[PDB]
Amino acid sequence: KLPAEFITRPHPSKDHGKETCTAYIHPNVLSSLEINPGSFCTVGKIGENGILVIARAGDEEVHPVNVITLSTTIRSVGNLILGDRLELKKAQVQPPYATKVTVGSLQGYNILECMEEKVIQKLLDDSGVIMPGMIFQNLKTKAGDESIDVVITDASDFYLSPPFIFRKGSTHITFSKETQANRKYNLPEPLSYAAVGGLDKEIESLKSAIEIPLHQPTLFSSFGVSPPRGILLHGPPGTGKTMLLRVVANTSNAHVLTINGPSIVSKYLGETEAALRDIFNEARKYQPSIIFIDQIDSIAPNRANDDSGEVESRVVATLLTLMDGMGAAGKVVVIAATNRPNSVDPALRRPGRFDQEVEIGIPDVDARFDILTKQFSRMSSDRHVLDSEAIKYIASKTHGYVGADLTALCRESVMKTIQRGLGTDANIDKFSLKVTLKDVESAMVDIRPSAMRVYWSDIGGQEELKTKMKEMIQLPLEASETFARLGISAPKGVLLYGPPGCSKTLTAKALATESGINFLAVKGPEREIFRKARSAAPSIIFFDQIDALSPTSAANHVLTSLLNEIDGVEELKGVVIVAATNRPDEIDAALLRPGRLDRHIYVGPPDVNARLEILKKCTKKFNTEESGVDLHELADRTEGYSGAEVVLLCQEAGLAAIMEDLDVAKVELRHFEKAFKGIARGITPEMLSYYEEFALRSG
Amino acid sequence: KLPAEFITRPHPSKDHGKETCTAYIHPNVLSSLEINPGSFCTVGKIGENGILVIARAGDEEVHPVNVITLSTTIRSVGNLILGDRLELKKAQVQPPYATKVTVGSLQGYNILECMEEKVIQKLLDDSGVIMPGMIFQNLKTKAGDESIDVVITDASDFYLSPPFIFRKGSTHITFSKETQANRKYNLPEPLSYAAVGGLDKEIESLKSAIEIPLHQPTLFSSFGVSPPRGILLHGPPGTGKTMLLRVVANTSNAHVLTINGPSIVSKYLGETEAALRDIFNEARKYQPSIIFIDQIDSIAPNRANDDSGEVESRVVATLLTLMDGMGAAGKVVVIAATNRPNSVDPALRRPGRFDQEVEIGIPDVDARFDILTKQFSRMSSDRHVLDSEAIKYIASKTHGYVGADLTALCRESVMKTIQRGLGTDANIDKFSLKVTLKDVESAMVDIRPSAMREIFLEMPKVYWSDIGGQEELKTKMKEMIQLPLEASETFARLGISAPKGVLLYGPPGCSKTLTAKALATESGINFLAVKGPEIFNKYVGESERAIREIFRKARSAAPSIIFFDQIDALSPDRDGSSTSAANHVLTSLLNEIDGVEELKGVVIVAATNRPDEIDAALLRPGRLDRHIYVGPPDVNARLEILKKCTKKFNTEESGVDLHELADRTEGYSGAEVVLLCQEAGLAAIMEDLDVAKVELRHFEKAFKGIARGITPEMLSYYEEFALRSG
Ligand SMILES: Nc1ncnc2c1ncn2[C@@H]1O[C@H](COP(=O)(O)OP(=O)(O)OP(=O)(O)O)[C@@H](O)[C@H]1O
Ligand SMILES: Nc1ncnc2c1ncn2[C@@H]1O[C@H](COP(=O)(O)OP(=O)(O)OP(=O)(O)O)[C@@H](O)[C@H]1O
């Protein structure tokens, strides 16, 4: 036989004392591994560490050969989750007697009802062998009818920790509050809801979805057939799937399995059917079982494409038949993780299989603040400044991106702080080092957001349109009672017409920044994107070009034909909608009727304030005191040029400087003069006059 | 040898002595398994729990090693059908002795004439191994009834069923009445023509066509005619074809072999046809065996297609040879399920291969009602207080719903009921919450028909009260679309069919599509919307394909209505016929509405702004026979529209009689007054924001803002186009 794989399972009957340090290995396996029942053996996940618990005969033969029963206390020491691989090693080192051990309490209660006439004996009757974990749940110990947890944090006198057998008189018992085990052994710590981010709605939905079949499957089976079993997690990558599934597996006492998917299927062999059947049979063997699937889309892509694969078809068919035959009254739940909803196979994403859909939204500034505070609390904050206002400012300054590799920002900030402190103090101890915020800001700028592959100070705005934009974003939304009682349709935005080089893009960026909600621009020449507007709900949608689709050509025709369905969807929830155009005369006559485009606003060159702000922002990279520019003469000279030619001027000046004196420390007026003379009068007056005529005829 | 698989087989004789706990295993494999004859072995389907049975020596030679022999009883424990996969394990556990057991036969009234000892002697021969699933014959001498049987219920004291050891002294048998098997053991319930219904003409025909070859070959031999070889079951997806195959396999004791789609094909050359040959040889080894093929279209497509290749042609050729070759013969039947028969190779669809073709159709109202009744009776008593009229109403509310979607609807209703039980009832016991009409009414949302997924858009929620128009048009349209449906027998005796056509010509903003969208929303029948320029494509023939697909979907989705948006966009180039695309589109439209193939369920409704370009071919009776002026509405309709619009406004506070406003509204068109009211509201909220009462100032501002908008020349043209008929 040679069993090279073993699993774990909690013992029944709720054994006390004798439950610890016992591994009821099969007698055939026990004799095969030349280990006596009265001997110490190493049980644990392969290649990681060991626990050194005493093996057992196994009592009756009704138990499966592969599985060995272990108590929950031992498993929690090395974070041995249900269904983890186990390995037995014959060699053993005699454990020395424990001396001057120390014990702690997980809860905050300390020095209360210190009887110790049975607690000390408890550490002796449980077959000895004291581990740093010692998660105690046996008997009923309390002080005023309240459960408490006792942890033997440390015992100092290739495994998780050296084995020590407790002795009645050779060691002294000291009690203190630690709330955690000693960090010298660096034992794994199970994840808790305190360490993870907030995600209140998502975590609540996931908890309800997991809980509903878990505790009452009999009622679902009696009421009907095919209860919900499949749970699908999708959204943007990096938001957290492996971490949350690990958390929900740790918090549950049911059997779990790790199914990556590439390892389950054997390439060019077609053994995925047998592998999946064996996995599901093992899951069905134990009533409490959890099925975890990672990257299900990669395992089973869409069947529409001819390149999906015959092995993909086989695995889809076997998954379908196994889900059909898994039964209804069983207490089984399947959790599937996928990268994008589009890559999910359409047959799998059908009613009756994955109805309970769980999605993780893009974290906002509040979620970023919450996760930052949670991480700072988890990290040792004996020195780090709390600074709620600083955290809020950092979160607001950061561009809106999903909670991906956010801990990497803290890691690189710590690295920068270490590098600064080493040079500052000539290799001093960490306790004397100081942590600042400039390094964190520099690291955050360097790493940059990776979600895609603007600020009100960065991009200015015109005051004339500020009141109108505020009205459009507030009155329909902030006070909808008047519209509801008067039956008045929402304005549904306005039409902005202006030259490509004017401040229309600047106005759009100012609107986006003032809204405070991230958005993706929709190109003119470029159904799925439009459908996502309703699903998200509170957001902003902007169209860069509408003139092309107003009257490629096929894409423009499709967009202008589907705009009719867009209006119907937008009628129910207008929220806010804006668009831009270059040829106003191409717009449809039926699109100018009241109730869809109530008002039309003309946009032109940026004002003096916006021009000054843009000049200051583009000069921020350069220097102002050495250059001597007042940031106003340039604006006066190039007021009518365009709203974006200043970037070209700065680029030309920088290029001239770097080709005239190589590395640059200051920028002289000669480069600016050359840039100004290079390009003159980019805009045209005739097209602006046409815009003015259109504005006049509009009303 | 290394035998890693086993197959169940029946005993040649009834084996009156040892019906139960008998499994013949070859001595060679048994010796290699280190299992003695007096040792228990668990056997069961792969991926499921096993059933323990005592090992038995094989019947000398001429006995296959792979097969394991059972007699009608061990197979029925886990609903093991002949030909299913089996797995053998050497792990055995001694079971406790049985005590206080009860036996009750299904389909039989509680009677005490069994003498209570003849059944006991049968249990003595069992010699242990007592499980809740046992099926016997009880011989004879029982009320003179030949077709009776007895089944054990359970016993009151990692296996599919709990095994107990029978003892005559302490058996303590008690008689009781109960249906099928106990649900607390989660045993596989043997289904036999319970869920499938509404296709009697088809299901009994299939049953006869399956029964006659296998069970009555003597008449075929005497008549000199070859028995049927293959039956093809083709139909729309979600019609229960796989369920039909499963039930027809379960209802018979045949050696079924199942292959499901691309699960057999592989990139390795010489493997798909080898597996098919092995399957056919195994089927031919046993006379009563049945071969089942699922998704034959994806396995053996047409060779005429240029994208097929060579492996597809080879697999098609080997399938044809195995079905009918010089050396290919037997006493087997092949069942193939597919969605489209066109993709199937014509050589496969030959009377020698597939003489009988089964065309599964979309369930009708009676079939849907039968399926719903069966689904609701599946849970039997103690719930479902709804009577037959509620089920009939639910069935009538669904038109294009396939049988697959009804199970999903029931599951959604159940889960919604469970979710609602956590709210107001505050986690009360679910044994008394039962099922109400409100639950299914709420669950009716967020579910779509299987064949009506992609082309369906967001459902409008506009009713009759929201819209306002002339009563004549709405009454005529309601009567035209409801009389064939409300009273079909009246038209049957009268011998008059539906007009199937109607045209609405009028000026824009004349209340035409709104009277159609609201009708589609209220009626509840399937609705299809076709836009004007949407069908127009640069490539020639794409529009024709789209129109044909839309018409086929309408035909296959029960009687419905097709409404065209901006049908005036297509025209014969305004003079004669020059562009080929427009002429082809028009000709295809006429052919689809009325051509060689006759369609009656769907009713065509269209609205055109300018009927001048519509030729007499489209205007002839039988396509767009009905014509309605659909001009401006009367004073009452406009007054109702204004009252509905003013209903949001404080009518009591304002106190205006709006009679002069009614006249002013009559002075304009339909959408013009709505735009006037919207612009007046916008002007009011821009001038003095919210107002408790709307005065005449804002209304006059709207009147001066929007002037005219309609010219009388089109009104005169419509009047003459309505009056020149005579
Ligand atoms: N909500 C969160 N709260 C706290 N930390 C988080 C959160 N989401 C992500 N993280 C951090 O980011 C890491 C990335 O998450 P995880 O390892 O679960 O990957 P994933 O997003 O599921 O994977 P993939 O890149 O394949 O989409 C986590 O290990 C954790 O450190
Ligand atoms: N006529 C019917 N009566 C009762 N239940 C039905 C009927 N048709 C379908 N169902 C239910 O809907 C399910 C869907 O059918 P099934 O999965 O067997 O596929 P199918 O309809 O044969 O289609 P496909 O071609 O996609 O395999 C069935 O398992 C059954 O529960």
Ligand SMILES: Nc1ncnc2c1ncn2[C@@H]1O[C@H](COP(=O)(O)OP(=O)(O)OP(=O)(O)O)[C@@H](O)[C@H]1O
């Ligand atoms: N009786 C009415 N009540 C309310 N609104 C109306 C009425 N008649 C017209 N309208 C308004 O005018 C629009 C056009 O009317 P309708 O839906 O009848 O279009 P139609 O006659 O099919 O014409 P087309 O689609 O070619 O513009 C409606 O969507 C609605 O906003």
